[PDB]
Design a protein around this nucleic acid. Structure first.
Ligand SMILES: [Zn+2]
Lengths: 119, 105, 122, 86, 53, 203, 50
RNA sequence: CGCGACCUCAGAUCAGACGUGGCGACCCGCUGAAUUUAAGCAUAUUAGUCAGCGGAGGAGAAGAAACUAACCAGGAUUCCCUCAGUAACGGCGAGUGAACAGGGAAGAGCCCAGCGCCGAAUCCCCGCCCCGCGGCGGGGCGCGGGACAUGUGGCGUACGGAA
C-alpha cells in the first residue's frame, strides 16, 4: 500500500559498499621524490641576486618547476631554520624556477647568506 | 606481331608474377634440415623402424595403371579381424590401421 | 671514505636513513660550493655523493621489497609488484597442471593401450 | 593581391603540437591530429605511405622496454634468482 | 506512471497472451490444479522429497 | 527423452503452436535492445547440440541483426569505372547474417570467446540469433580438459577469422570436386599457390 | 607573444638551451670528427615553424 | 497488506580475473578499382590484385569424407614433380585455366549433443591443518555457501554401442 505520488519512476537508491580488497595493488607506497633537499637545487650568486639579498632582506634560490610556494616556504624553513615572510616565484626562460624568499625582519638575510656560504 | 611461320603461343605473364616468383635457393638447406629431422626421429625411436608403421598391399584404381601394387594407407578392420589383431593394439604395435578401407575381393 | 653495500646490507633502517640525510646535506653543500666556484676537489665529489645516495637508496629498497615478499610468501593473493612479471602472453598460459590434466577416457585409453617397444626382422 | 599581399595576413595558426606523436599536426578546430589521430584510439597508419610508415616504427624510438624484453628472452626469461655469491 | 521498459514489456506480454488466440497446446497449462488438491499433492510429496546435502 | 521431442517440435515450425511462439518471441526480442545477454538458452536442445554446457563460465547473448542485402557504400551515384561495377542496389554480402551477429557479439565481448550460434527468430527487418560465449579465464573451463582448448591464444576471436560454424560456410571450403578451390589453406592460399612461378635451381 | 602556455615556454627554453656552440675541449678527443655545431638556429632565419 | 520462493531486470570505488593498443615479412575473414591488353571500346583482361577494415601465432589456415573413382578400386589435411598450358571458360578474340590418378616429404588420430544406464555419483568459491609455493597445486577436516534436474560427471559416437 504505497501510492505513487509522482508519475515519474526514478531509479531507487541501492546499497553500495566500500573497497575491501583482498590484497593491495602496490606492495608499498612510493617514496616521496620532492623532499626538502630535492626541491631546492642551489641559490643564485649573481650580482642582481646579491643586491636583492643585501637590499630587500631576501634570498634567491633555484627550485624545481613542480614546487609550490607553500612547498618552497616549508623547505626553506626546514633546511635553514629560518622564518619566511613571503615567496615570489617565476620561471626563467631556461627551465629552472627562480624563487625570491623574503625573510621576516627579525632575521638577517646577509647573515643567512654568510651561513649558507654565498656572498 | 607474327613473323614468317612462328608457333602461336600465349604466355601467362600478364599478372604481377615478379612479386610472386618463388626461388629455390633454399633447396639444399631444406634437404639438410629434413635429413637431420629424419635422423633425430630415428634416434628417438631407437628399436623402432626408421620408415615407420607397416603398410598394406594395395592395388591402383584408374585402369591406366591397373596392375601396379603400392603401399596402402593402413590395414583394414576385416583384415585385422581375420589375422586376430585388435585394431587399437595394432596402433601400439606398429601396424597402420585405417577404418575407411573396403574389401571387395 | 667509500660507502659499500657490504656495510650497508647489515645496518639498521634508521642508520640508513640518517646516512641518507647526511649525504643529502653534503650534496646540497657541494651544490652551493659549485655555484660559488669552490674547487675541482669539491666538484668531483658531486658524483661520489650521488652514487653513495644511489647505493643507500638501492639497499633500502631491496631490503624493504625482500621483507614485503617474505611477508606475502605463502598467501594466495599478493601485490602485483611482488607477482612474477615474465610476459603478457606468458602469464596467461595454463596453470602447468591444467595442461597435465587428462580426461578419464584419455587416461583409460593410455593405460589400456600404451605405446610398445618393438623391433622387426628377428 | 593573391600572392605577396595575401601572404602578409598569415597571423593565426591552425595546427599545434600533438601530445601523442609530438608532430605539429593537432588541428585546433577539428580536435584531430591528422598524423596519428590522437582522439582516435588506434594509431593512424596507411600502407600507401611506406616511407611515412618507416619513419615511426618499433625500431625508431628508444625501446626502453623492448630491449630488456629481448635480453630477458635471450637469457631465458628467468626471474626471482641471483648468481652464486662470493 | 511511466514504467521502465522491462516492466512495460512484461505487462504487455501478458496482455498479448490474453489477447491473441492462443493454441490449445499452450492454453492447456491455464487449466491449473485447484487449491485443495494442490495442498493434498504437496503433503503427499513431502514424504517423498529427495535427500538433500 | 524430452530433447528429441523438443527437436521435433522446433522442426515443425509451420504448426500453429510454433508459429504463435515464434511470433511472440520475435515481438519480445524486437522490443529489446540489439545486444542483450540472455540468462538461459531459448533452445536448450540446440544449445546442447552446438556445445553449450549448463555450467559456470558459459554465456549466451541475443543479437538482433537488420535484414536485407548490402548496397554499395558510395554516394548517390559516382561509381566511377566500367559499367560492370555500376551495380549498387542488388548486391549481397559474402558472409551470412548469423556470421555478422557472431562478429558483433565477439567484438562487444572482447574477454569472452565465441563458440557457436543459433537462430531464434526473424522479423521482416530483423533477424534474431543467440550466440554462445565462454569465459577463457574461468576455472570451471580451464581445469576441464575437454573445454580448455579455447584457453589457448590461437583461438582468439574465432568469428573474426571465420572459424565458427556460421563463418566456416562462407569460406566455401570442403572435400571433393564440388569446390576445387580452397584446396590449400583457403581460397587465397590456393590462388597464391596456383599463381606462384616456381623457378627451380636447375630449371 | 607574452601570452605563451607552459608547454610552449618549456619547448622554447629547450630550443634556446640547445643553441649554444660546442665546447672547445670536445675537438681534443681522439676519435673526434666534429668541427662545428651545424645545428645552431638564428632567430632571423629558419623560423622554427611552431 | 505484508512476509516468503521463482522468472526477468538495474545499481555498485562490492571480491577475484579478463579485452582494449603496437608490430604486421608470413597467415585468416571481408570490401575492393583504374591505369594496361584487346592495336579503338562497352563483356572480358589487369583482378579476389593495389588501396581500405578487422583478427592471432611462431607459424596460421586446413584436416580426419554428406571424398575420389567406375577400376581386380583407392582412403585425413599440408607441400614438391607430373598430370598441364590439358579438360574446360572467353565480342570462343585478346586471353583465362583446374582436378583425378601416379611418385615422393610427413604421417596420429579423436571428442560431444542425441539414444540410454548410474541416489548430481558433477563443478565453482570461502575457513583451518600438512607439503610446497618466481608458469598457486595435492590431500584431509568443514550440517560453510553457490552453480546444476530448463541436465554436470562416468560408460559411450558410426570404425557400431550398451546390458
Ligand atoms: Zn599526433
Amino acid at each position: 500500500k504505497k501510492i505513487r505520488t509522482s508519475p515519474t519512476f526514478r531509479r531507487p537508491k541501492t546499497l553500495r559498499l566500500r573497497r575491501q580488497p583482498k590484497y593491495p595493488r602496490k606492495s608499498a607506497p612510493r617514496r616521496n621524490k620532492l623532499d626538502h633537499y630535492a626541491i631546492i637545487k642551489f641559490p643564485l650568486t649573481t650580482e642582481s641576486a646579491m643586491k636583492k639579498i643585501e637590499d630587500n632582506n631576501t634570498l634567491v634560490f633555484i627550485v624545481d618547476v613542480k614546487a609550490n610556494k607553500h612547498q618552497i616556504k616549508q623547505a626553506v624553513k626546514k633546511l635553514y631554520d629560518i622564518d619566511v615572510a613571503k615567496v615570489n616565484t617565476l620561471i626563467r626562460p631556461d627551465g629552472e624556477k627562480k624563487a625570491y624568499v623574503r625573510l621576516a625582519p627579525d632575521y638577517d638575510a646577509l647573515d643567512v647568506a654568510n651561513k649558507i656560504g654565498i656572498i | 606481331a607474327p613473323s614468317r611461320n612462328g608457333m602461336i603461343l600465349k604466355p601467362h605473364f600478364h599478372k604481377d608474377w615478379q612479386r610472386r616468383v618463388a626461388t629455390w635457393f633454399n633447396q639444399p638447406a631444406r634437404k639438410i634440415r629434413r635429413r637431420k629431422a629424419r635422423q633425430a626421429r630415428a634416434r628417438r625411436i631407437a628399436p623402432r623402424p626408421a620408415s615407420g608403421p607397416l603398410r598394406p598391399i594395395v592395388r591402383c584404381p584408374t585402369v591406366r595403371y591397373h596392375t601396379k601394387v603400392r603401399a596402402g594407407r593402413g590395414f583394414s578392420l576385416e583384415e585385422l579381424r581375420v589375422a586376430g589383431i585388435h585394431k587399437k593394439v595394432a596402433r601400439t604395435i606398429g601396424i597402420s590401421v585405417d577404418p575407411r578401407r573396403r574389401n571387395k575381393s | 671514505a667509500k660507502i659499500k653495500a657490504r656495510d650497508l646490507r647489515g645496518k639498521k633502517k634508521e642508520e640508513l636513513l640518517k646516512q641518507l640525510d647526511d649525504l643529502k646535506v653534503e650534496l646540497s653543500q657541494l651544490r652551493v660550493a659549485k655555484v660559488t666556484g669552490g674547487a675541482a676537489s669539491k666538484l668531483s665529489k658531486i658524483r661520489v655523493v650521488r652514487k653513495s645516495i644511489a647505493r643507500v637508496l638501492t639497499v633500502i629498497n631491496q631490503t624493504q621489497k625482500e621483507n614485503l615478499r617474505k611477508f606475502y610468501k605463502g598467501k594466495k593473493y599478493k601485490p602485483l609488484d611482488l607477482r612474477p612479471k615474465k610476459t603478457r602472453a606468458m602469464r596467461r598460459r595454463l596453470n602447468k597442471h591444467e595442461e597435465s590434466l587428462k580426461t578419464k577416457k584419455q587416461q583409460r585409453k593410455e593405460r589400456l593401450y600404451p605405446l610398445r617397444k618393438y623391433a622387426v626382422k628377428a | 593581391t593573391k600572392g605577396t599581399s595575401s601572404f602578409g595576413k598569415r597571423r593565426n595558426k591552425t595546427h599545434t603540437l600533438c601530445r601523442r606523436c609530438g608532430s605539429k599536426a593537432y588541428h585546433l578546430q577539428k580536435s584531430t591530429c591528422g598524423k596519428c589521430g590522437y582522439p582516435a584510439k588506434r594509431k593512424r597508419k596507411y600502407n600507401w605511405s611506406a616511407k611515412a610508415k618507416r619513419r615511426n616504427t618499433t625500431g625508431t624510438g628508444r625501446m626502453r622496454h623492448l630491449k630488456i624484453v629481448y635480453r630477458r628472452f635471450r637469457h631465458g626469461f628467468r626471474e626471482g634468482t641471483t648468481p652464486k655469491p662470493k | 506512471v511511466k514504467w521502465p521498459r522491462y516492466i512495460r514489456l512484461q505487462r504487455q506480454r501478458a496482455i498479448l497472451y490474453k489477447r491473441l488466440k492462443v493454441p490449445p497446446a499452450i492454453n492447456q497449462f491455464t487449466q491449473v490444479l485447484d487449491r485443495q488438491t494442490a495442498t493434498q499433492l504437496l503433503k503427499l510429496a513431502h514424504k517423498y522429497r529427495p535427500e538433500t546435502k | 527423452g524430452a530433447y528429441k521431442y523438443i527437436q521435433e517440435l522446433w522442426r515443425k515450425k509451420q504448426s500453429d503452436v510454433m508459429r504463435f511462439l515464434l511470433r511472440v518471441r520475435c515481438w519480445q526480442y524486437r522490443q529489446l535492445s540489439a545486444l542483450h545477454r540472455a540468462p538461459r538458452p531459448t533452445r536448450p536442445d540446440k544449445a546442447r547440440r552446438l556445445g553449450y554446457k549448463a555450467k559456470q563460465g558459459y554465456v549466451i547473448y541475443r543479437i538482433r541483426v537488420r535484414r536485407g542485402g548490402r548496397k554499395r557504400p558510395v554516394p548517390k551515384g559516382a561509381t566511377y569505372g566500367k559499367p560492370v561495377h555500376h551495380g549498387v542496389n542488388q548486391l549481397k554480402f559474402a558472409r551470412s547474417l548469423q556470421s555478422v551477429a557472431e562478429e558483433r557479439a565477439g567484438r562487444h565481448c572482447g574477454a569472452l570467446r565465441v563458440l557457436n550460434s543459433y537462430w531464434v527468430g526473424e522479423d521482416s527487418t530483423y533477424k534474431f540469433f543467440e550466440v554462445i560465449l565462454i569465459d577463457p579465464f574461468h576455472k570451471a573451463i580451464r581445469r576441464n580438459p575437454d573445454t580448455q582448448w579455447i584457453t589457448k591464444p590461437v583461438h582468439k576471436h574465432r568469428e573474426m577469422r571465420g572459424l565458427t560454424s556460421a563463418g566456416r560456410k562462407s569460406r566455401g571450403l570442403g572435400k571433393g570436386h564440388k569446390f576445387h578451390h580452397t584446396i590449400g589453406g583457403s581460397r587465397r592460399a590456393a590462388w597464391r599457390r596456383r599463381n606462384t612461378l616456381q623457378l627451380h635451381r636447375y630449371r | 607573444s607574452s601570452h605563451k602556455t607552459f608547454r610552449i615556454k618549456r619547448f622554447l627554453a629547450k630550443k634556446q638551451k640547445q643553441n649554444r656552440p660546442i665546447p672547445q675541449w670536445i675537438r681534443m678527443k681522439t676519435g673526434n670528427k666534429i668541427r662545428y655545431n651545424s645545428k645552431r638556429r638564428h632567430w632571423r632565419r629558419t623560423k622554427l615553424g611552431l
